[PDB]
Amino acid sequence: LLNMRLRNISLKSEHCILSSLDFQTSKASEQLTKKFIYPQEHNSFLKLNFQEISYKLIDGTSQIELDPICPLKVPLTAFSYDSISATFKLVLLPKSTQPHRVKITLAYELELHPNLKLPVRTSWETSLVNSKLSNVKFKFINSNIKVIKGEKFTMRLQIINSSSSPLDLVVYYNNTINPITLENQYQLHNKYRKIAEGIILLSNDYKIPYFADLRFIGIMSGYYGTLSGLKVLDLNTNELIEVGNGASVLI
Amino acid sequence: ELSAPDTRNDYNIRGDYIATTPALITFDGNESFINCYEITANNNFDSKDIFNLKVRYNTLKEQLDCFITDAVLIEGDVEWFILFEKWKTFWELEILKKLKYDYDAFKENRIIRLLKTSIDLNKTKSKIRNLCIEKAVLDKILICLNKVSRGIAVCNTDMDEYVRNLVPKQLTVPVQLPGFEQFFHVQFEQMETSHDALHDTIATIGNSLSYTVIVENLSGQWGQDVIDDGGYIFEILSSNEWLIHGQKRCAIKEKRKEFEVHLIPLKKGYLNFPRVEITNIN
Amino acid sequence: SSQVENVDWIEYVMSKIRAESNLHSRDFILLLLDFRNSWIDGIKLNVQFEDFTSNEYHVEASHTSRIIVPIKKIDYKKYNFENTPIPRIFPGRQFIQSGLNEEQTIEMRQKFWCREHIISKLKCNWKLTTDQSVTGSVDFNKFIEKFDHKMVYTIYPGRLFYGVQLLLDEPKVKVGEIINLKIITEPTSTCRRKQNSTVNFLDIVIFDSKTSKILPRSNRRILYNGSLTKPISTTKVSEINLEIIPIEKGRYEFSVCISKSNNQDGIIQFDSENVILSVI
Amino acid sequence: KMTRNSWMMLDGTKTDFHITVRNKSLSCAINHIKIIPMNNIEQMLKPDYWKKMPPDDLYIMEKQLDWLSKSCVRIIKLITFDLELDNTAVPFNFTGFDLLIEYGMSATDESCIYLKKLSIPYEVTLRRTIEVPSMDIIPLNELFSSQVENVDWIEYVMSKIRAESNLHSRDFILLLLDFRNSWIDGIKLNVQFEDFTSNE
């Protein structure tokens, strides 16, 4: 074995988990072979890695990678092509057969037949927030990453619960500073002074009765990921329910 | 002040610190004092010369004692004419055992003495030939400085060119690396998400060994992370470099190395032996 | 920016940031108030401040509509807000002891006088929909219930301990311009409060435009000649200054923070001027 | 599981794929674009009501409960596929309508009717936006004098009593109908007959 490699599959909750095996012909056989080649007056080898594709299942299909693969042949390089893989709905882990081939055109144009094709198990190795009191769940129908200027915009929230008491929630945005190491002492304040100053909710204390279009305008600009001021609350048995979801860039 | 070398080799500086009005510091090192200097380049770009600096420091126990020997005891043309006129060596022996407590010299007070004693000092003043008026002024000054306070007044009025300035010097000499090169990469945001709106860092690094590596890292973003896995073609120039990944990921790990320092030596054509790579989103 | 002039309260502060450029921004505040009708008819609701003209609103039968009225601040060196407090409608009476602390009397005077200041120029006007004849007004004396400590900070700037402003000349700086920053400090009408501390300490903190909390050693960033503590004088103006040699990024904000000592949590004013410069 | 709509002709593009087992993740070779549900409901409901105009004893009123769903089907040709564009098109829905379902047909053949079934549950409620619970009809007999042309329904019968004088008055009737909304918002309500334009 010469080309040392690793299998990296990264898991995302946008129903995607990409795969990019990294390869690098490391020093272990290089320290011997590039001194035999140094005795034979060569220090720029070229193993023509040009043929490589993946396999998904028993239907061994070449999945279309997100990146390209031309004739890659140089000395001491290292490559990691990224391939889009569909994320499963559960722990159905598709074992995979990583196939590759490099035709080792050595010094004095000496080709050598070699390939790197083997199989393993391609495990990854690892919107909505639920309630605390009721069966209520909160999601935003409009997409949680959205573009706007400093002007007005429409924002829309899902309320789905059990219809045993299907009512009496209230919103309020609570535009005041949470009053709160010295650089962290002026970091938590500058977090809170742009939470409570950025957007303003133009219909607060909105009685809900499912669907409601909540009404904001934002003043100053930035990335308001998990815009966390707004609090709905159940008027019986008052618990501070929070919706820490959604985002808004203002450029 | 930073010193250009004795060759006078046209190394231009732009910044320099002359604290004329702010003759004021405190250096317990929990707070940080930083002085920075912007050296420029000459017609020739070399490595080694001599650099020195004129740190014109003092001591706080000189400053507040020169305040105490000119305002709190001897601020007259009578007492400093006849009472503490020739007995100033006794005052300069009395001053160096005072131990003024400097923990509240910059918290709502200045010149507040610590817990020494005064009866033995009064007995030593009585055992010499000190007069009654001079002992009256000295006992009044020590009685006032038994517990006292001050504002930031006479921060330079009580040492307006009446103090020594122990002008130190050192030697810094512009340390340099081994291998000099210049790369230029080519980014292409083939992003799995839409865009993370990453913020840039156009790096310019150095490496000082032989058969070595000069690694690099990509930009840092703050959106929904572990994504925007970019595409990159290397396109390094004027060298025989190495590689780490083509179409790498801008995730929690980046690891975009370039082990180019194992070959392709060159000259010291810059101020040091560096390499300034610069990607571009295309 | 331009073309945002489609929203009724923008163009007031645009039209006085174009002309009369001494009257700057980041000092205009918005007062936010929600109407709610206990009636079956629609109401048309044109609000006037001393020159602000809201457009033709509509409130149907329960639907609140938060009017966003822009005003300016008040200047603490222009009005005295420590004058005879809570003046009686009729002179005379028993003249009994107040029975309250003098400090409490101060905050009661401020929380009354700012309230009547925002009463005295705010006039709504309205008309019904289904009749279009029975116009009317309201008055807000029974409406605005009191102020609390957020409101008396936001209208009245003199409640704060210090008042600073801070300017950076020519905000297009390329790389190599060591440029002084200018801070003008003025202690407020609460200069009478403490007076046993005669020094207070002014940390100048550095924020990125997009991200936050640049560490103070600050390489590939702003380098500073001096240090960022710079103690300031109570009861007098003081012009601190610091020189900025920038290396490379896009844009930054400067702000200050006052801390009354150098121990932890003695900090008193999280002040928020935040000038931005643009670096190529 | 989606959520409610008003009386508008909206659309749905649902997120999750179904199973749809086949050989592999190759192309399905016939993908539906306009699914069009609730275009069965307007040839259910008019054959409901036009046999409700005699008394009900028919087979269409014989213990039927397919109006609770009105579940259509989507047929296709020769793995998992994300959901298409619906164009749900709700305008004629009964007030008992509360659910829908989609028994998708997963086809594959050589010369064979070899299919399967793939079923989805859908719950949706209704915004009862505006209602006209009554109407009444009043005739008229007065010819209206000039300058009364400030009221939207006068000028129609004025403009055809000036021109086309054979079409006389005292035969035009007015039909009178009252809207009432069960909603928190205002509604703007421009009515058209074959040429009459009510105002805002």
PDB file of N, CA and C in Angstrom, chain B residues 143-192:
ATOM      1  N   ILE B 143       2.448  63.920  58.881  1.00  0.00           N
ATOM      2  CA  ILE B 143       1.110  63.808  59.442  1.00  0.00           C
ATOM      3  C   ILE B 143       0.040  63.888  58.364  1.00  0.00           C
ATOM      4  N   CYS B 144       0.250  64.722  57.340  1.00  0.00           N
ATOM      5  CA  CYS B 144      -0.685  64.777  56.221  1.00  0.00           C
ATOM      6  C   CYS B 144      -0.611  63.509  55.382  1.00  0.00           C
ATOM      7  N   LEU B 145       0.591  62.976  55.182  1.00  0.00           N
ATOM      8  CA  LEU B 145       0.766  61.763  54.400  1.00  0.00           C
ATOM      9  C   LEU B 145       0.662  60.500  55.237  1.00  0.00           C
ATOM     10  N   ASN B 146       0.217  60.606  56.492  1.00  0.00           N
ATOM     11  CA  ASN B 146      -0.190  59.421  57.240  1.00  0.00           C
ATOM     12  C   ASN B 146      -1.414  58.770  56.609  1.00  0.00           C
ATOM     13  N   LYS B 147      -2.363  59.584  56.153  1.00  0.00           N
ATOM     14  CA  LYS B 147      -3.460  59.128  55.306  1.00  0.00           C
ATOM     15  C   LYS B 147      -3.861  60.293  54.419  1.00  0.00           C
ATOM     16  N   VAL B 148      -3.705  60.130  53.110  1.00  0.00           N
ATOM     17  CA  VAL B 148      -3.998  61.208  52.179  1.00  0.00           C
ATOM     18  C   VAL B 148      -4.520  60.617  50.878  1.00  0.00           C
ATOM     19  N   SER B 149      -4.782  61.507  49.921  1.00  0.00           N
ATOM     20  CA  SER B 149      -5.271  61.154  48.597  1.00  0.00           C
ATOM     21  C   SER B 149      -4.930  62.300  47.664  1.00  0.00           C
ATOM     22  N   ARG B 150      -5.031  62.036  46.363  1.00  0.00           N
ATOM     23  CA  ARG B 150      -4.805  63.073  45.367  1.00  0.00           C
ATOM     24  C   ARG B 150      -5.586  62.752  44.105  1.00  0.00           C
ATOM     25  N   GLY B 151      -5.777  63.784  43.294  1.00  0.00           N
ATOM     26  CA  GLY B 151      -6.371  63.663  41.971  1.00  0.00           C
ATOM     27  C   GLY B 151      -5.253  63.414  40.956  1.00  0.00           C
ATOM     28  N   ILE B 152      -5.547  63.572  39.671  1.00  0.00           N
ATOM     29  CA  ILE B 152      -4.528  63.516  38.634  1.00  0.00           C
ATOM     30  C   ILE B 152      -3.853  64.864  38.386  1.00  0.00           C
ATOM     31  N   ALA B 153      -4.061  65.843  39.266  1.00  0.00           N
ATOM     32  CA  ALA B 153      -3.348  67.108  39.194  1.00  0.00           C
ATOM     33  C   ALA B 153      -1.883  66.909  39.544  1.00  0.00           C
ATOM     34  N   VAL B 154      -1.042  67.785  38.969  1.00  0.00           N
ATOM     35  CA  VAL B 154       0.429  67.716  38.993  1.00  0.00           C
ATOM     36  C   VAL B 154       0.940  66.363  38.510  1.00  0.00           C
ATOM     37  N   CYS B 155       0.348  65.875  37.419  1.00  0.00           N
ATOM     38  CA  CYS B 155       0.871  64.676  36.781  1.00  0.00           C
ATOM     39  C   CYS B 155       2.142  64.979  36.004  1.00  0.00           C
ATOM     40  N   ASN B 156       2.314  66.229  35.575  1.00  0.00           N
ATOM     41  CA  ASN B 156       3.575  66.694  35.025  1.00  0.00           C
ATOM     42  C   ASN B 156       4.010  68.042  35.576  1.00  0.00           C
ATOM     43  N   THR B 157       3.160  68.727  36.348  1.00  0.00           N
ATOM     44  CA  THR B 157       3.551  69.998  36.948  1.00  0.00           C
ATOM     45  C   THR B 157       4.601  69.812  38.037  1.00  0.00           C
ATOM     46  N   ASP B 158       4.534  68.710  38.775  1.00  0.00           N
ATOM     47  CA  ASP B 158       5.497  68.422  39.828  1.00  0.00           C
ATOM     48  C   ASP B 158       6.697  67.631  39.332  1.00  0.00           C
ATOM     49  N   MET B 159       6.821  67.427  38.021  1.00  0.00           N
ATOM     50  CA  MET B 159       8.042  66.880  37.442  1.00  0.00           C
ATOM     51  C   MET B 159       8.340  67.516  36.091  1.00  0.00           C
ATOM     52  N   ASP B 160       7.961  68.783  35.918  1.00  0.00           N
ATOM     53  CA  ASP B 160       8.209  69.514  34.684  1.00  0.00           C
ATOM     54  C   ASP B 160       9.688  69.813  34.497  1.00  0.00           C
ATOM     55  N   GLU B 161      10.377  68.854  33.852  1.00  0.00           N
ATOM     56  CA  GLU B 161      11.819  68.845  33.561  1.00  0.00           C
ATOM     57  C   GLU B 161      12.675  68.947  34.821  1.00  0.00           C
ATOM     58  N   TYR B 162      12.187  68.394  35.931  1.00  0.00           N
ATOM     59  CA  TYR B 162      12.949  68.317  37.168  1.00  0.00           C
ATOM     60  C   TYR B 162      13.330  66.882  37.505  1.00  0.00           C
ATOM     61  N   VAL B 163      13.263  65.982  36.529  1.00  0.00           N
ATOM     62  CA  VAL B 163      13.464  64.565  36.766  1.00  0.00           C
ATOM     63  C   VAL B 163      14.450  63.992  35.761  1.00  0.00           C
ATOM     64  N   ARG B 164      15.173  62.969  36.201  1.00  0.00           N
ATOM     65  CA  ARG B 164      16.036  62.189  35.334  1.00  0.00           C
ATOM     66  C   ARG B 164      15.204  61.289  34.426  1.00  0.00           C
ATOM     67  N   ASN B 165      15.829  60.825  33.348  1.00  0.00           N
ATOM     68  CA  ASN B 165      15.147  60.000  32.355  1.00  0.00           C
ATOM     69  C   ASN B 165      16.108  58.909  31.898  1.00  0.00           C
ATOM     70  N   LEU B 166      16.015  57.737  32.526  1.00  0.00           N
ATOM     71  CA  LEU B 166      16.961  56.642  32.315  1.00  0.00           C
ATOM     72  C   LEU B 166      16.691  55.977  30.968  1.00  0.00           C
ATOM     73  N   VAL B 167      17.226  56.583  29.911  1.00  0.00           N
ATOM     74  CA  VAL B 167      16.908  56.190  28.541  1.00  0.00           C
ATOM     75  C   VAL B 167      17.532  54.860  28.147  1.00  0.00           C
ATOM     76  N   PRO B 168      16.763  53.781  28.238  1.00  0.00           N
ATOM     77  CA  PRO B 168      17.303  52.462  27.946  1.00  0.00           C
ATOM     78  C   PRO B 168      17.374  52.223  26.441  1.00  0.00           C
ATOM     79  N   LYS B 169      17.989  51.104  26.069  1.00  0.00           N
ATOM     80  CA  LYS B 169      18.091  50.699  24.675  1.00  0.00           C
ATOM     81  C   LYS B 169      18.164  49.183  24.608  1.00  0.00           C
ATOM     82  N   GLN B 170      17.790  48.635  23.455  1.00  0.00           N
ATOM     83  CA  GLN B 170      17.833  47.196  23.235  1.00  0.00           C
ATOM     84  C   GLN B 170      18.295  46.952  21.807  1.00  0.00           C
ATOM     85  N   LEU B 171      18.131  45.718  21.339  1.00  0.00           N
ATOM     86  CA  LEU B 171      18.578  45.343  20.002  1.00  0.00           C
ATOM     87  C   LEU B 171      17.620  44.306  19.433  1.00  0.00           C
ATOM     88  N   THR B 172      16.766  44.737  18.512  1.00  0.00           N
ATOM     89  CA  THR B 172      15.936  43.852  17.712  1.00  0.00           C
ATOM     90  C   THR B 172      16.392  43.944  16.264  1.00  0.00           C
ATOM     91  N   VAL B 173      16.388  42.799  15.568  1.00  0.00           N
ATOM     92  CA  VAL B 173      17.140  42.725  14.321  1.00  0.00           C
ATOM     93  C   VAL B 173      16.428  41.986  13.190  1.00  0.00           C
ATOM     94  N   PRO B 174      15.086  41.994  13.165  1.00  0.00           N
ATOM     95  CA  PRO B 174      14.232  41.667  12.008  1.00  0.00           C
ATOM     96  C   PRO B 174      14.448  40.237  11.496  1.00  0.00           C
ATOM     97  N   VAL B 175      14.024  39.278  12.324  1.00  0.00           N
ATOM     98  CA  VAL B 175      14.235  37.857  12.055  1.00  0.00           C
ATOM     99  C   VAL B 175      13.499  37.390  10.802  1.00  0.00           C
ATOM    100  N   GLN B 176      14.130  36.468  10.070  1.00  0.00           N
ATOM    101  CA  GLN B 176      13.683  36.060   8.746  1.00  0.00           C
ATOM    102  C   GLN B 176      13.663  34.541   8.630  1.00  0.00           C
ATOM    103  N   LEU B 177      12.862  34.058   7.685  1.00  0.00           N
ATOM    104  CA  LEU B 177      12.661  32.635   7.466  1.00  0.00           C
ATOM    105  C   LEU B 177      13.649  32.108   6.420  1.00  0.00           C
ATOM    106  N   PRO B 178      13.411  30.887   5.930  1.00  0.00           N
ATOM    107  CA  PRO B 178      14.336  30.204   5.027  1.00  0.00           C
ATOM    108  C   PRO B 178      13.960  30.347   3.554  1.00  0.00           C
ATOM    109  N   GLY B 179      12.743  29.958   3.172  1.00  0.00           N
ATOM    110  CA  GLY B 179      12.363  29.834   1.766  1.00  0.00           C
ATOM    111  C   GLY B 179      11.398  30.942   1.360  1.00  0.00           C
ATOM    112  N   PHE B 180      11.669  31.572   0.216  1.00  0.00           N
ATOM    113  CA  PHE B 180      10.844  32.648  -0.327  1.00  0.00           C
ATOM    114  C   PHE B 180      10.200  32.183  -1.627  1.00  0.00           C
ATOM    115  N   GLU B 181       8.896  32.426  -1.763  1.00  0.00           N
ATOM    116  CA  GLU B 181       8.145  32.074  -2.967  1.00  0.00           C
ATOM    117  C   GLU B 181       6.925  32.987  -3.061  1.00  0.00           C
ATOM    118  N   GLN B 182       6.047  32.700  -4.028  1.00  0.00           N
ATOM    119  CA  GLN B 182       4.821  33.474  -4.233  1.00  0.00           C
ATOM    120  C   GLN B 182       3.820  32.605  -4.982  1.00  0.00           C
ATOM    121  N   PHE B 183       2.705  32.277  -4.339  1.00  0.00           N
ATOM    122  CA  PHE B 183       1.640  31.493  -4.947  1.00  0.00           C
ATOM    123  C   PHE B 183       0.440  32.383  -5.259  1.00  0.00           C
ATOM    124  N   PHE B 184      -0.524  31.812  -5.993  1.00  0.00           N
ATOM    125  CA  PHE B 184      -1.801  32.471  -6.285  1.00  0.00           C
ATOM    126  C   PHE B 184      -2.821  31.387  -6.612  1.00  0.00           C
ATOM    127  N   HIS B 185      -3.808  31.197  -5.741  1.00  0.00           N
ATOM    128  CA  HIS B 185      -4.785  30.130  -5.911  1.00  0.00           C
ATOM    129  C   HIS B 185      -6.012  30.643  -6.670  1.00  0.00           C
ATOM    130  N   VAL B 186      -7.073  29.826  -6.723  1.00  0.00           N
ATOM    131  CA  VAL B 186      -8.289  30.165  -7.468  1.00  0.00           C
ATOM    132  C   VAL B 186      -9.467  29.440  -6.820  1.00  0.00           C
ATOM    133  N   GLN B 187     -10.271  30.177  -6.055  1.00  0.00           N
ATOM    134  CA  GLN B 187     -11.412  29.604  -5.359  1.00  0.00           C
ATOM    135  C   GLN B 187     -12.630  29.535  -6.272  1.00  0.00           C
ATOM    136  N   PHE B 188     -13.521  28.595  -5.967  1.00  0.00           N
ATOM    137  CA  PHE B 188     -14.805  28.499  -6.656  1.00  0.00           C
ATOM    138  C   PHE B 188     -15.805  27.923  -5.669  1.00  0.00           C
ATOM    139  N   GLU B 189     -16.735  28.754  -5.211  1.00  0.00           N
ATOM    140  CA  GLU B 189     -17.658  28.368  -4.147  1.00  0.00           C
ATOM    141  C   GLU B 189     -18.764  27.494  -4.734  1.00  0.00           C
ATOM    142  N   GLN B 190     -18.485  26.192  -4.806  1.00  0.00           N
ATOM    143  CA  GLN B 190     -19.488  25.208  -5.206  1.00  0.00           C
ATOM    144  C   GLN B 190     -20.203  24.741  -3.946  1.00  0.00           C
ATOM    145  N   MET B 191     -21.074  25.605  -3.440  1.00  0.00           N
ATOM    146  CA  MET B 191     -21.554  25.486  -2.075  1.00  0.00           C
ATOM    147  C   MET B 191     -22.724  24.516  -1.967  1.00  0.00           C
ATOM    148  N   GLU B 192     -22.678  23.670  -0.935  1.00  0.00           N
ATOM    149  CA  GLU B 192     -23.777  22.750  -0.661  1.00  0.00           C
ATOM    150  C   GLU B 192     -24.999  23.493  -0.144  1.00  0.00           C
TER     151      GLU B 192
END
